[PDB]
Write a protein that binds this ligand. Structure first.
Ligand SMILES: OC[C@H]1O[C@@H](O[C@H]2[C@H](O)[C@@H](O)[C@H](O)O[C@@H]2CO)[C@H](O)[C@@H](O)[C@@H]1O
Length: 326
């Protein structure tokens, strides 16, 4: 709905994931500044300066709620509020992403140890904290569910119901099973459907270019990247979206800076996304990435090759989030 817009027209479709509040997730709670990191004004200013108004921001449940019998961590909420504040001051809107893989402290959401009600409450409580914030675009209620033994769809509806008890205005982003793979979407999530009477739900998949779909880009699995593998891995998902009359988001995709074939695949993917008015978020920019080959964070004030590749694709004349249903 209130999707960010570009200055010369169109929508802010193509954004960035920003580190690093979900870093080192096995270390909980860990310490801010050591194990995980939050961005500063420089990051939001840089990406705004590049014409980027969309940000996906991972965090983990374990740092907002250390235990199910505990309330929310005040400082972590304050850190997320700061993130939303700095985004909004720079004309950006943020997707808060609970980067939790269908699990809480390693146990499955929907298991006896982590009931659906515990997930619903945390999202209800989080939505109470951030309801109405100008820099908030919506809630990516779970990153990359996998091996959830049938538990993910019920958990997603429990969180949505709870969120809509307190906030009927924020967008909600729904990922699917099999790590929310875009290529596998029509087979894994063939009959996947969450109920949102607000009509403010978007489905979200991830897509990488290596042979095992993982985005790790190991040497043996990254030797033959077709220039169209990005379009081929997006199309199943887009086609499922069009058939079900639903809106999409490619929440992660990224390439190493040393694979020319990956560059071509990214250019053709973003072009295809634009043709369908489908937004995306590059993985990843922000603090703490060092020389990570996929990182789009500049170094020495030198733009990264992936930022330079993104720029040709920012302009559009879309007025609604797609794809366009049949
Ligand atoms: O990274 C996103 C991407 O993961 C892809 O599959 C991987 C998974 O990421 C990896 O950790 C696991 O061990 O094996 C699989 C093999 O694909 C995944 O298919 C996509 O859903 C996901 O978007």
């Amino acid at each position: 709905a209130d999707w960010p817009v570009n200055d010369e027209g169109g929508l802010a479709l193509h954004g960035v994931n920003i580190s690093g509040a979900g870093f080192a997730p096995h270390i909980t709670p860990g310490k801010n500044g050591t194990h995980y990191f939050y961005p500063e004004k420089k990051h939001f200013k840089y990406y705004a300066d590049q014409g980027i108004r969309l940000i996906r921001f991972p965090f983990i449940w374990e740092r907002v709620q250390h235990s199910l019998d505990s309330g929310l961590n005040f400082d972590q909420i304050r850190l997320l509020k700061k993130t939303l504040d700095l985004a909004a001051q720079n004309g950006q809107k943020v997707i808060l992403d609970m980067h939790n893989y269908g699990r809480y402290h390693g146990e499955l959401i929907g298991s006896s140890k982590v009931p659906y009600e515990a997930y619903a409450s945390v999202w209800r409580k989080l939505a109470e904290r951030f309801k109405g914030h100008p820099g908030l675009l919506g809630y990516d209620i779970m990153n990359e569910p996998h091996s959830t033994v049938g538990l993910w769809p019920g958990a997603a509806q429990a969180a949505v119901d709870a969120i809509r008890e307190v906030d009927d205005q924020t967008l909600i982003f729904i990922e699917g099973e099999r790590w929310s793979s875009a290529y596998h979407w029509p087979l894994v999530n063939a009959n996947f459907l969450i109920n949102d009477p607000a009509d403010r739900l978007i489905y979200e998949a991830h897509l990488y270019f290596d042979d095992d779909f993982s985005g790790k880009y190991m040497a043996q699995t990254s030797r033959n990247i077709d220039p169209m593998i990005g379009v081929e891995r997006a199309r199943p998902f887009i086609e499922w979206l069009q058939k079900h009359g639903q809106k999409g988001f490619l929440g992660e995709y990224g390439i190493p800076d040393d694979l020319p074939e990956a560059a071509q695949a990214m250019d053709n993917l973003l072009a295809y996304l634009n043709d369908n008015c489908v937004p995306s978020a590059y993985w990843a920019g922000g603090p703490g990435w060092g020389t990570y080959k996929l990182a789009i964070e500049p170094r020495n004030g030198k733009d990264r090759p992936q930022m330079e590749l993104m720029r040709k694709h920012l302009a559009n004349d879309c007025t609604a989030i797609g794809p366009t249903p049949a």
